[PDB]
Amino acid sequence: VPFVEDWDLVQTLGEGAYGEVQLAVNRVTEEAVAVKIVDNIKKEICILKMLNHENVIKFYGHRREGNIQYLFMELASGGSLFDRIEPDIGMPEPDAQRFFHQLMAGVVYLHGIGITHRDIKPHNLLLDERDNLKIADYSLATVFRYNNRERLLNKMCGTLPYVAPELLKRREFHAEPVDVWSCGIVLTAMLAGELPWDQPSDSCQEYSDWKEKKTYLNPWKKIDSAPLALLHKILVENPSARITIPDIKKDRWYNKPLK
């Protein structure tokens, strides 16, 4: 029975690097939210206050009491996308398409306010009560565009299986194609229930196989040809040849009506 101001901390929603996320219920008003408990945080809070979109987690405010900082956030009561992906199977293509559409709406939004998330993966993609997707966890996020000027990134971060090959090979790189790449790994995972490689490096046989277009192997053989054509445009090793979001939105599978 911990608590803070009027909120009871009632169960553990997740455990991060630093601290945890608790379900917080306001025993007066009965509203339930998510609270991140910690100890970088300054920057994180600053980014969180910018966010206003139906496919990104909303920020309500914070309290600083003692060592511990409390970040109050929208609750996504459906839990994570990670848990809707059956291992070795994925999920039905129409659910995968709808989630993808929503993930792109969120990414467009972030990029439009000049924020790169940098750790897009199914653990960070949460579902509200009607299965609406929300992009969560802004602890690795950063500003890549300010006063209409882009800056290149140089820090390596993210999660190896989701990371774009340039992030391992170039000293500096553009932000947007890295997020687009990780969305293509998410889409693979939804449609096949498996990640295609441990990392996109020259010493990873699975990545070499894909560059050599061996799509008779898994996970690619589990995927229908229309979504696979899109994946061919997303998972392109040269970031300036990689498809952009405006072009993803014209792709034939992206616009296919599904049941």
Other C-beta atoms closer than 10 Å to the C-beta of 217 total 11
Query: Is 134 annotated to bind ligand?
Result: no
Q: Which is nearer to ligand A0T, 53 or 145 (CB)?
A: 53
Query: Is 18 annotated to bind ligand?
Result: yes
- Cβ-contact 139, 202 below 8 angstroms: no
Smallest gap from Cβ 201 to ligand A0T, in A, equals: 28
Which residue has tokens 């511990």? 68
Whether omega before 219 lies within 30 degrees of 0, making that bond cis, reads: yes
Q: Which residues contact 225 (CB under 8 A, 6 or more apart)?
A: none
Q: Which is nearer to ligand A0T, 76 or 178 (CB)?
A: 76
Smallest gap from Cβ 172 to ligand A0T, in A, equals: 30
Query: Is 158 annotated to bind ligand?
Result: no
CA–CA distance, 228 with 207 (Å, rounded to integer)? 16
* Helix 176-192 vs helix 93-112: crossing angle, to nearest 10: 170
Q: Which is nearer to ligand A0T, 80 or 219 (CB)?
A: 80
Query: Is 21 annotated to bind ligand?
Result: yes
Smallest gap from Cβ 31 to ligand A0T, in A, equals: 13
- Cβ-contact 86, 39 below 8 angstroms: no
Query: Is 56 annotated to bind ligand?
Result: no
Q: Which is nearer to ligand A0T, 166 or 179 (CB)?
A: 179
- Cβ-contact 141, 57 below 8 angstroms: no
CA–CA distance, 117 with 75 (Å, rounded to integer)? 19
Query: Is 19 annotated to bind ligand?
Result: yes
Residue nearest to ligand A0T (CB): 79
Residues forming contacts to ligand A0T in the complex (CB under 6 A) are 13-14, 21, 34, 36, 57, 73, 75-77, 79-80, 126, 136-137
- Cβ-contact 228, 181 below 8 angstroms: no
Length of the chain as a residue count: 259
Query: CA torsion sign, 111 to 113 to 119 to 123?
Result: negative
Smallest gap from Cβ 34 to ligand A0T, in A, equals: 3
Q: Which is nearer to ligand A0T, 139 or 207 (CB)?
A: 139
Smallest gap from Cβ 238 to ligand A0T, in A, equals: 33
Choosing from 119, 131, 137, 224, the catalytic residue is 119
Whether omega before 196 lies within 30 degrees of 0, making that bond cis, reads: no
Our answer to whether residue 83 is catalytic in this structure is no
Binding residues are: 13-21, 36
Please list the active-site residues.
119
